[PDB]
Design an enzyme around this catalytic site. Sequence first.
Site, PDB file in Angstrom:
ATOM      1  N   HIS A 123      39.039  36.626  47.880  1.00  0.00           N
ATOM      2  CA  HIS A 123      39.125  35.447  46.995  1.00  0.00           C
ATOM      3  C   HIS A 123      40.572  34.991  46.759  1.00  0.00           C
ATOM      4  O   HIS A 123      40.863  33.795  46.833  1.00  0.00           O
ATOM      5  CB  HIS A 123      38.448  35.740  45.659  1.00  0.00           C
TER       6      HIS A 123
ATOM      7  N   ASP B 288      34.636  30.199  45.488  1.00  0.00           N
ATOM      8  CA  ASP B 288      34.025  30.849  44.340  1.00  0.00           C
ATOM      9  C   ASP B 288      32.617  31.322  44.680  1.00  0.00           C
ATOM     10  O   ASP B 288      32.205  32.391  44.274  1.00  0.00           O
ATOM     11  CB  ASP B 288      34.003  29.902  43.133  1.00  0.00           C
TER      12      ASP B 288
HETATM   13  N1  LIG Z   1      40.233  36.798  42.658  1.00  0.00           N
HETATM   14  C1  LIG Z   1      40.396  37.368  41.443  1.00  0.00           C
HETATM   15  O1  LIG Z   1      41.410  38.037  41.224  1.00  0.00           O
HETATM   16  C2  LIG Z   1      39.339  37.208  40.409  1.00  0.00           C
HETATM   17  C3  LIG Z   1      39.586  37.529  39.062  1.00  0.00           C
HETATM   18  C4  LIG Z   1      38.557  37.389  38.136  1.00  0.00           C
HETATM   19  C5  LIG Z   1      37.297  36.925  38.515  1.00  0.00           C
HETATM   20  C6  LIG Z   1      36.190  36.764  37.492  1.00  0.00           C
HETATM   21  C7  LIG Z   1      36.756  36.002  36.323  1.00  0.00           C
HETATM   22  C8  LIG Z   1      36.777  34.621  36.366  1.00  0.00           C
HETATM   23  C9  LIG Z   1      37.300  33.885  35.321  1.00  0.00           C
HETATM   24  C10 LIG Z   1      37.803  34.547  34.213  1.00  0.00           C
HETATM   25  C11 LIG Z   1      37.783  35.930  34.165  1.00  0.00           C
HETATM   26  C12 LIG Z   1      37.263  36.669  35.220  1.00  0.00           C
HETATM   27  C13 LIG Z   1      37.054  36.597  39.832  1.00  0.00           C
HETATM   28  C14 LIG Z   1      38.068  36.745  40.773  1.00  0.00           C
END
Ligand SMILES: NC(=O)c1ccc(Cc2ccccc2)cc1
EC number: 3.1.1.4
Length: 123
Positions: free
Chosen positions: A46, A91
């Site tokens: 991601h 996402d």
């Molecule tokens: N790629 C990442 O580091 C990463 C980090 C967190 C999340 C899930 C999340 C989404 C919004 C707010 C808090 C947590 C997904 C990916």
Amino acid sequence: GILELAGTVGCVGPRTPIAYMKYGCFCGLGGHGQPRDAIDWCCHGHDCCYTRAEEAGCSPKTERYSWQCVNQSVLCGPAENKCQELLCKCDQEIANCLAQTEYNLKYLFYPQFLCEPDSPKCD
Ligand SMILES: NC(=O)c1ccc(Cc2ccccc2)cc1
Ligand SMILES: [Ca+2]
């Protein structure tokens, strides 16, 4: 953006997006080192996706996009431009990735000093 990221992750997976807020070496703001487990690989992948999106001239943390949650699956759209499609794809990918994983509690607030300087390559 971050609002959709949280939503998509919550849609598909069995746990709060907060579960990934600082987990392993990659889940959370930034990230470096050897991914610790499957979840950490999802976040690494991601982070890579968002970097690509930034390189394409998008703002992955802020831009809003439309999506639907149908049977705990993310459907992207309607997209007004290319950035919204790239973002939603990023996402959607992590939501799908994390949904298939088992949680290792021990990696929640894992000590950053154990995370190595370099990282696996993107792609
Ligand atoms: N790629 C990442 O580091 C990463 C980090 C967190 C999340 C899930 C999340 C989404 C919004 C707010 C808090 C947590 C997904 C990916
Ligand atoms: Ca990260």
